[model samples]
Target: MILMIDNYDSFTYNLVQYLGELGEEVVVYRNDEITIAEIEKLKPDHLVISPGPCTPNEAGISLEVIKHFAGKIPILGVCLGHQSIGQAFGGKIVRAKQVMHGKTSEIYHNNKGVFKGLNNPFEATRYHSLVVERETLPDCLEITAWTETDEGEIMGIRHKTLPIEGVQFHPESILTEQGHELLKNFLKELEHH
Candidate 1:
């Protein structure tokens, strides 16, 4: 089972569909609408913070959700959700040099966590105007994916000691190569606990 904290984004439906086919009983909630206690009652096996417009600060209760669930369940954060995880873990989110919307880029990853067994130079659909500042990243979180472009932007991260991972790209997007495999890799994390 999974509880998706929708940040009022249209892309949330795509994620809902992605996970539903994985045989998950996915439940939806607005990032600001549900209380922590309410989520606790639902007791999801996983939580996915959806990609949405605006900064993580304005993503509404997202930072709060990260605080409460980071250690308890597997969480996959996408785009804005990735930024929230970064901010929540003492990383800084700042405006990127360029806005990437519906653009595909080559992703270079460390082959850890969700990216395990994936290829280098993997193509992913990126959509964001803000990014997690690389230099300010806390030691607790390790960068698992980045771009080969001049931006060298962070594309993914994994918590050093938590069932937490975040991707700046949209795995749900049709343009991303091996996107379903990436999601399947993320769900395999549930097997660890």
Candidate 2:
């Protein structure tokens, strides 16, 4: 089973539907409302922090949710989920000089960790005005992928010891050239470990 911390509309239904096709059961919580008790109740094999229009550290319930979830399950983040993960683990999110949206750039995947077998230069659909700055990243997290965008924004991050990861872009976006494969590769990491 997989639990998705539902923060917004697009990610809530979409991710579940996609993962379902891949033969996984999914559950959802409404906008930063996910609780540790609820998660423990579900006991999902994986927890996905989904993308949304909100920020993670603006003194909200979202912060509490991520901080709690990250320490427990194998977690994955997309877009705002990515930002929230970074923020929870000591990373900062700021407005990009120019916002990036839609099928825009190439993600230079590190091809390391769970992403080890992926082909380099994976394309992704991006939709976010905020960027996770590298220098602000906490010691426990490290950027694993980047793009040609400003400052080579932190595209992905993983905990030094846990099966946790976050991505600044939405690899689940089917509109992108190679979205499905990227997600499978990321999920495949969990299989290997």
lDDT, each prediction: 0.77, 0.67
Tell me the deviation in Å of residue 2 in model 1: 0.7
TM-score of 2: 0.82
Per-residue error (Å), model 1, residue 19: 1.7
Q: List the candidate 2 regions with Cα displacement exceeding 4 Å.
A: 32-34, 54-61, 101-103, 171-177, 188-193
Error of 2 at 80 (Å): 1.1
Per-residue alpha-carbon lDDT of model 1 for 91-120, expressed as tens digits?
Answer: 887777665645678889989978888877
The local distance difference test score of model 2 is 0.67
> How would you encode candidate 2's per-residue C-alpha lDDT over 76-159 as one tens digit per residue?
777567777777877777766665655567878777644565557767666654677776778888778788765577677888
Best by lDDT: 1
